Design a protein around this ligand. Structure first.
Ligand code: CL
Ligand code: CL
Ligand code: CL
Lengths: 204, 205
């Protein structure tokens, strides 16, 4: 009776949900916000971090990457969303890392703009993170141009993470981009969003 | 050959360094800051995140957990720092998660205090993170009280990450702790810091 705790509008929560489904692991989804339902969340995990995974035996896990590591173990080698071959796995880890970096910077911009008064915003911080955000997608765009991702309907962790990251960035920090930027990244993300597993796991 | 970019006073860089040594993988260390030497770091990894691992072929990786995943694969199954059986691996992942959570919150308090003018610091944000930080170590404490970590000379990822986290928190956010808090966590960390691999990888020079 796996249980995923968190809102799907969080890229970290969403990547775990889509990975769970792609891995073929049934679960219960509890949409609880770490902001609007702080106590209910704390009652499940006192650190109040989303996503939180409650295992069958009740063990509580956090950090999307560690949770997925667990799920990969639970699903077995054949179901893996990661390549096992070293060079291919290396490329996959770089793509996921860039996607997670994009998520991190996007969330940082959101937190800076929404968890403190406008008076307290720090221009230098926003500038720094915004540049890092642009860099993360730029690096991803370059990787995708070198070796496009398959569009056979199947998904790997890089594909899941990149698509979730892009959609999240466009929903929350769209002002950081010009319409035509990162065409390959946007292209894969919009293709992915039309896949059954993405349609069944809406961000909102 | 393998290069680790980043300063060891970062718990994320340090956990990778100790993991590298623990896996028996040789590497070169470039202690480069992401602040004063921002441009130098950007030339290596434009996203400018520490740690950054430059692979023997030149590929660039970031995020300590992903880097360690690559390293475990590179090292081989014989050298893993993680248990493979489900129950044991589950516990290990829970421990690593709590330690990473402590690192995250500790770093958030440091950034709120050190990267912005005093006038721009927001008390409610600090109060929130501070509570989460106390919660993380509280959970770790209960876990260790229930089932102590082995003290036999070798290390797992939970041990490495827990110790690196505790020491970092004491080094940069000491005001958040009283002497009597989290004795089991403090105890293992203090034990771990005296192990050869931790002594050979100091948080500061
Ligand atoms: Cl997470
Ligand atoms: Cl592509
Ligand atoms: Cl990291």
């Amino acid at each position: 009776s796996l249980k995923l705790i968190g809102m799907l509008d969080s890229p970290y929560v969403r990547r775990v949900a889509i990975s769970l489904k792609s891995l073929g692991l049934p679960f219960e989804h509890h949409s609880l916000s770490v902001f609007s339902t702080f106590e209910q969340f704390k009652a499940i995990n006192p650190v109040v971090k989303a996503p939180t995974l409650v295992c069958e035996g009740g063990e509580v896990l956090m950090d999307s990457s560690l949770i997925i590591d667990y799920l990969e173990t639970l699903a077995g080698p054949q179901r893996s969303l990661m390549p096992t071959a070293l060079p291919q796995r290396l490329r996959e880890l770089r793509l996921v890392g860039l996607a997670l970096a994009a998520c991190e910077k996007s969330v940082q911009i959101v937190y800076e703009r929404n968890l403190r008064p406008a008076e307290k915003q720090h221009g230098p911080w926003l500038e720094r993170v915004g540049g890092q955000l642009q860099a993360a997608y730029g690096e991803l765009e370059q990787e995708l141009q070198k070796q496009p991702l398959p569009r056979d309907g199947s998904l790997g962790q890089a594909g899941i993470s990149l698509a979730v990251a892009w959609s999240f960035s466009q929903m929350m920090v769209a002002d950081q981009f010009n319409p035509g930027q990162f065409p390959a990244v946007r292209g894969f993300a919009e293709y992915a969003e039309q896949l059954p597993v993405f349609l069944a796991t809406p961000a909102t």
